[PDB]
Design a protein around this nucleic acid. Structure first.
Lengths: 49, 49, 143, 305
DNA sequence: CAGTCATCACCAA
DNA sequence: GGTAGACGCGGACATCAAGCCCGCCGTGAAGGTGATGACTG
RNA sequence: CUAAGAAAUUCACGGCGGGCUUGAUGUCCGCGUCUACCUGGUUCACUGCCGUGUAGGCAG
């Protein structure tokens, strides 16, 4: 996934060069996802108790 | 899918801040709806952005 | 309810098979359970979200299903008109970030259990349902 | 010690959420101490109303998967955790780490009682399975049935009363029901045997077990070789640190009846051999046997050699 | 005037 | 609704040169212990 | 009487742009398949024949 820096950045180390250009630069992440197929609309969930 | 309930967070630490946020969002909703947002999303659906 | 009660007594056999169907939409995103992985990937070529899978299937943890089943407590003394929460000692809720049923307002599980066993001070019936629900839930206690 | 007449197969035991640490120096498959504790917990609830005994367990282990994850930049693992509830001030609790794994397991029991001639053995099989399906196999629950509701019933057969030809067909008919598993036995003679390879260095013993479950490589006089089995370090009992305490002495004990020691683990060795490699299936069974006075507590399997 | 309950700095490659 | 009885040999398989640049990799929560300090019934 | 007994990980996202794979070629060569015979299957267990009702001369 390509994204943007969209968090509260830390002004603890207040840099007028890095934390303003890193807003402009992207953010590359790797996640998981689970979809239904394009021809399925019903989710089935089964367990025992 | 268009879900709704768009001001209530799903994870929080405070309760006073949660009530303040929900009454702020209700202040937003009960004098103007989502109509200015909804017709802009309907524009971006209507053309093929 | 009579069958689950006759199973909780210890008298007859009980084994349920629960299936749930949920029409959502074509090709939509379903949400299986995400497992806590504390401090994984000190390299920045990492993986942020990791979903839980039993063998070639998306899955939900068992403790989450049990947490869904024991949302029984309506009797908590902070503000009872907000929905049933899960049965807990110091009866708390992690999404809300707040512990209802606080021992300064003497209605948690330790106070009521000690008054109702050691001192025979019986609480109200509604707090007694909470005290028994912590015994169906189970726990680990000490000195 | 006492060889049983009939063996009791508990065919499919798909169990979930078992413990996977099992000692301070191992991880993976749980300790067989859990299995012999499970069979004596069957003894205290079923074996007295059937007037039988159940001493040994055939640990077979068809499947295995652990709730672990491979991190980035590392070739090690970590464990997937649970999220514990909050403290009473609303803050988040600390983290205690419990490894966790699912299993699929077959079992082979050993009967010794008068109920085998007071009853049909199908009564023993049905009652033992219907009670053991309400217990916890290692640290986690025992699951009910599914699409696999066809191997649900048991079997039981003797070995003394019968012919001595087609018992090969009988035990290899049993082996048709535990065919994809790898049995687990006690192979502690090789821990003695790998001291002579280190007898040129020292008569020490604590680093010998840490030599066999890995890939040792030197260069040409690359050195890879066939390891002589599926040899793994298992835990094998408890050794006493502290003398035996009278049952009212130790503060915060589970019981006010039994005496208590403070102990710690001792480590042996095992192998994940297929059940074909051993002729008689009664060789595999694990037994508790420990002398009380000097505090050595230990489990192993006899009759393997 | 004495138990007890929330907070407080104490450390720490 | 018929058997019957067999299936070949030899020989060979291409050379040349080349493989991209640029920016970026998220945040929050996951501490026990005495020791007064405030409360204290 | 089982390192026994207990547990909610939550949430968000633009990978993107460009492009000549070229050129050449002999698959040659040979072969005896050989002999043998009786459907009126019932090409419907009966077609079509004086009464549509159970006895009959016909192309048999």
């Amino acid at each position: 996934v390509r994204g943007t820096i969209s968090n509260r950045l830390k002004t603890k180390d207040r840099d007028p060069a890095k934390l303003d250009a890193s807003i402009q630069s992207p953010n590359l992440q790797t996640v998981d996802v689970a979809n239904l197929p394009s021809d399925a609309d019903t989710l089935k969930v089964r367990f025992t108790l | 899918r268009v879900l709704g309930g768009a001001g209530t967070p799903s994870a929080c630490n405070d309760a006073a801040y949660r009530d303040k946020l929900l009454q702020t969002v209700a202040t937003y909703v009960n004098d103007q709806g989502f109509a200015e947002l909804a017709r802009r999303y309907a524009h971006n659906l209507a053309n093929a952005r | 309810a009579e069958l689950i009660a006759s199973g909780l007594s210890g008298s007859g056999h009980v084994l349920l098979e629960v299936v749930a169907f949920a029409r959502i939409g074509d090709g939509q995103e379903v949400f299986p359970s995400q497992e806590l992985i504390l401090d994984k990937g000190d390299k920045k070529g990492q993986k942020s979200k990791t979903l839980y899978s039993v063998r070639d299937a998306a899955a939900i943890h068992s403790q989450k299903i049990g947490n869904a089943l024991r949302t029984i407590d309506t009797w908590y003394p902070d503000e009872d008109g907000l929905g049933p929460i899960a049965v807990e000692p110091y009866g708390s809720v992690t999404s809300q970030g707040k512990a209802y049923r606080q021992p300064k307002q003497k209605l948690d599980f330790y106070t009521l259990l000690d008054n109702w066993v050691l001192r025979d001070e019986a609480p109200a019936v509604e707090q007694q349902h909470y005290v028994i629900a912590n015994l169906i839930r189970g726990g680990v206690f000490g000195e | 010690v006492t060889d049983p007449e009939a063996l009791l197969l508990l065919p499919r035991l798909s169990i979930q959420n078992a413990n996977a640490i099992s000692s301070p120096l191992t991880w993976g498959f749980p300790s067989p101490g859990a299995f012999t504790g499970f069979v004596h917990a069957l003894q205290r609830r079923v074996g007295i109303s059937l007037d039988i005994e159940l001493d040994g367990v055939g640990i077979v282990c068809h499947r295995f998967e652990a709730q672990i994850s491979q991190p980035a930049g590392k070739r090690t693992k970590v464990f997937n955790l649970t999220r514990n509830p909050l403290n009473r001030d609303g803050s988040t609790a600390a983290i205690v780490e419990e490894g966790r794994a699912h299993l699929e397991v077959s079992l082979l029991l050993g009967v010794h009682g008068d109920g085998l001639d007071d009853h049909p053995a199908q009564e023993i099989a049905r009652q033992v399975q219907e009670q053991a399906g309400a217990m916890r196999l290692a640290g986690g629950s025992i699951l009910p049935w599914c699409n696999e509701r066809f191997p649900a019933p048991n079997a039981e057969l003797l070995m003394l009363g019968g012919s001595d030809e087609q018992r090969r067909k009988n035990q290899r008919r049993l082996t048709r029901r535990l065919l994809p598993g790898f049995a687990l036995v006690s192979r502690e003679a090789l821990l003695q045997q790998h001291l002579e390879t280190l007898r040129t260095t020292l008569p020490e013993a604590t680093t010998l077990d840490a030599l066999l479950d890995l890939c040792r490589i030197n260069f040409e006089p690359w050195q890879v070789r066939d390891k002589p089995g599926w040899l793994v370090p298992i835990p094998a009992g408890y050794n006493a640190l502290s003398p035996l305490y009278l049952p009212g002495e130790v503060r915060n004990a589970r019981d006010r009846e039994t005496p208590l020691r403070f102990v710690e683990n001792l480590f042996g060795l095992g192998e994940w051999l297929s059940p074909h490699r051993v002729a008689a299936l009664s060789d595999l069974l694990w037994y508790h046997h420990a002398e009380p006075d000097k505090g050595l507590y230990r489990w192993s399997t006899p009759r393997f050699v």
